[PDB]
Design a protein around this ligand. Structure first.
Ligand SMILES: CC(=O)N[C@@H]1[C@@H](O)[C@H](O)[C@@H](CO)O[C@H]1O
Ligand SMILES: CC(=O)N[C@@H]1[C@@H](O)[C@H](O)[C@@H](CO)O[C@H]1O
Ligand SMILES: *[C@@H]1O[C@H](CO)[C@@H](O)[C@H](O)[C@H]1NC(C)=O
Ligand SMILES: *[C@@H]1O[C@H](CO)[C@@H](O)[C@H](O)[C@H]1NC(C)=O
Lengths: 439, 439
């Protein structure tokens, strides 16, 4: 047998789905979402890290002049100066008072630290869904894992489960993302080869190991301090290290629906959006012919007390009589109320208690068991607490709601005098019809 | 200086782009598309290959009966039979004439050949673009490679090139694709775990090395032939090997726009769709002040003959006079005609010849050189050939076209008698206005 259902995309909220098959006892299964993972694409746009500035020993000269020869290196720069008269510990370096010259040059390279610490920019666009389910089958909890895209089919305990596809294509991610060691950020990185100094992307590297790099750091030299031998540099401050200082809030806090985000691999998990379709092919072995199930008769219901709450605040006692000892499923056919229990053993002329959750001020509903219906009417009361920690979406109430006793009040209010006014209009128009024929 | 242009997405067709800068001699660059590669996503849905059927030695028994014990193996099957009296070379296996029994069983596993030969199904959805360009710069052809998505920037010979993004998002691929050793097919494979026997996907494996597999082969046993010892099997024929027999046309022939398809990695290349935007930042070093360029004067044009064709069938001779020896660019400002040459050396009061392509029956156009314009009028003739092999899109002609001498004819035809009829109407209405005042 094949059964298809749909459930809200929520985690930790048990769901009852009643599959019925003529000629056999109908059975209701409990399905729970352990977690749902969304794996986005991974197109590594590039990486970046802190840079090291290499400035070899400056070239000094006397009574002669140096010269700049271009170097095919990133952001390589050079300069010359004249008239410098450096002094060392033992005295002047050389005699030429002003005929001397100084040549300096520098460049910037990647740091070995990049091999361990860095920030990587990807252009992830799409994603795939995988999920974990817990199912109450034959009186035991069973775990299943499958891709929640409507394609993956999984066989367990002789039954075939298919999940997905996700109703909503929404994702918390973005086309372009930047990832640190364990943090993710939605942020539009500058295009490769156009890094703006002092900002993210100031140095661009294709891979942590690729020797080729790109840089933009305005490396300008300056005239050295008089009387000293040294190289000054106007090295641009590293925007990469700085961006780590102003990273801002991570996406695990800014993600709508709070989809928890992990790494290695990067996934977004546990966000409630849309719903999921599930198709279950269940072999008939689990199915039991109706004759096998014990009968039921003399059904009475009572509610000693009930309390509409996020928990199972409602308790109902039912008196039942059955043919023989045996298991029997229990369900509520009204979505406004949910029942924690799935089935129960029935011996005969006995009673039982059931714990349920509702949201109506007055709970008036039918309950199905052993292919029989029993009414239940009660007046719940508001609990004391206004907010709770654990989640509970079972007790969902639409705009339609039970006015309870006040229902009668509005039923009494609905009475109007339109009938009498129409009667008066008819009477006047007829008594006029003596003179009013067809106008 | 920054210049932005757009060119049709075509390969092998040179394109002239004239960048002009006041205060310097304008320069026209030739850009050609070597190839454009589209790399689609790669999400390996699964793989498949031929399967091997393992049927160990059947269990024989006499005067007793065997039994089937379930095996947690793919498509494992078993059966028993009674009354079989097998015979071997030396005589009957055993005495029990009919009390004997036979137990048989079999299963199906992956083949070691899968490690070498197989077919892999992917769910590639999106793609990225990379391209190769040839540019005529400073009188030399230079090659550039970059991602054609409007992001990658490439520095060459002191100039910054940016290409893309692709105007059209169209692709020849599809969300779901199946790849053989060197062939690709657009084909919707069945979902994993639901392989239909005798068709592609009949056996499903997550990876070539993963031990776990899924199968669907209706392995039913049969009663062995009387008087013999052997195992019959109703093994399902392998749909995988068969699909190789009816693969059909590959996508390299069915792809619109003929985008050539490769593998390892899978790319679609050389398909003309849409256009490409290109932004070039050119340092002023290449730019030359107008005063540097020699002047030009006494410009005359003549066409000894021309022939509108896919080739450079037009030849034009120009008499020119210049101030001094020097290079000078040449261009045509009308898109209806293209010129093969980019620049030329000019010595002074001399002449030159230029080879060009057109599509107008009568070619009437201006030509720009050394910031000066020269007219050129000629009457081309149709060539003899009706179809050619090499591609040529330069000579593009819109609905607007030169009627040539016949233009005058229609200009003569345009004359109408509406003027005289309006004159007659005015005359009659006025001579009536004696009695017609304002109606
Ligand atoms: C060592 C460790 O615990 N975590 C990571 C390691 O996986 C990674 O390979 C390395 C740089 O590649 O950075 C660190
Ligand atoms: C050997 C060769 O030339 N080509 C391929 C090889 O690259 C591949 O690894 C192997 C199966 O994985 O099938 C073959
Ligand atoms: C299934 O999970 C519930 C959750 O609390 C647990 O109480 C129960 O013992 C588990 N096993 C069953 C229902 O067989
Ligand atoms: C550039 O390519 C053309 C193509 O044929 C070739 O003729 C020419 O020699 C190449 N080099 C140039 C134009 O410097």
């Amino acid at each position: 047998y094949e059964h298809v259902t749909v459930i809200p995309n929520t985690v930790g909220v048990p769901y009852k789905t009643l599959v019925n098959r003529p000629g056999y006892s109908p059975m209701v299964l409990e399905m729970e979402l352990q977690s749902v993972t969304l794996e986005p694409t991974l197109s590594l746009d590039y990486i970046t890290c802190e840079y090291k500035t290499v400035i070899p020993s400056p070239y000094v000269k006397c009574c002669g002049t140096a010269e700049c020869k271009d170097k095919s290196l990133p952001d390589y720069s050079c300069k010359v100066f004249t008239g410098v008269y450096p002094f060392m510990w033992g005295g002047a370096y050389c005699f030429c008072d002003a005929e001397n010259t100084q040549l300096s040059e520098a460049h910037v390279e990647k740091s070995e630290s990049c091999k361990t610490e860095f920030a990587s920019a990807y252009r992830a666009h799409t994603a795939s869904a995988s999920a974990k389910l817990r199912v109450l089958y034959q009186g035991n909890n069973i775990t299943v894992a499958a891709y929640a895209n409507g394609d993956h089919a999984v066989t367990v305990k002789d039954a075939k489960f298919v999940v997905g596809p996700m109703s909503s294509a929404w994702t918390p991610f973005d086309n372009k993302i930047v990832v640190y060691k364990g943090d993710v950020y939605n942020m539009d990185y500058p295009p490769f080869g156009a890094g703006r100094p002092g900002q993210f992307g100031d140095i661009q590297s294709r891979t942590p190991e690729s020797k080729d790099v790109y840089a933009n750091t305005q490396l300008v030299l300056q005239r050295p301090a008089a009387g000293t031998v040294h190289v000054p540099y106007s090295q641009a401050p590293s925007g990469f290290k700085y961006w780590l200082k102003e990273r801002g809030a991570s996406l695990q806090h800014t993600a709508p629906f709070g989809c928890q985000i992990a790494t290695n691999p990067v996934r977004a998990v546990n966000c409630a959006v849309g719903n999921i379709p599930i198709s279950i092919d269940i072999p008939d072995a689990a199915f039991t012919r109706v004759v096998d199930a014990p009968s039921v008769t003399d059904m009475s219901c009572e509610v000693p007390a009930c309390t509409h709450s996020s928990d199972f605040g409602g308790v109902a006692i039912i008196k039942y009589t059955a043919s023989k000892k045996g298991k029997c499923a229990v369900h509520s056919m009204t979505n406004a109320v949910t029942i924690r229990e799935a089935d129960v053993e029935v011996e005969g002329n006995s009673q039982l208690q059931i714990s349920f959750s509702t949201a109506l001020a007055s709970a008036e509903f039918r309950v199905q068991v052993c292919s029989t219906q029993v009414h239940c009417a009660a007046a719940c009361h508001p609990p004391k607490d206004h907010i709770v920690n654990y989640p509970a979406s079972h007790t969902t109430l639409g705009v339609q709601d039970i006015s309870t006793t006040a229902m009668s009040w509005v039923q009494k209010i609905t009475g109007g005098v339109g009938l009498i006014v129409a009667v008066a209009a008819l009477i006047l128009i007829v008594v006029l019809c003596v003179s009013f024929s067809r106008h």
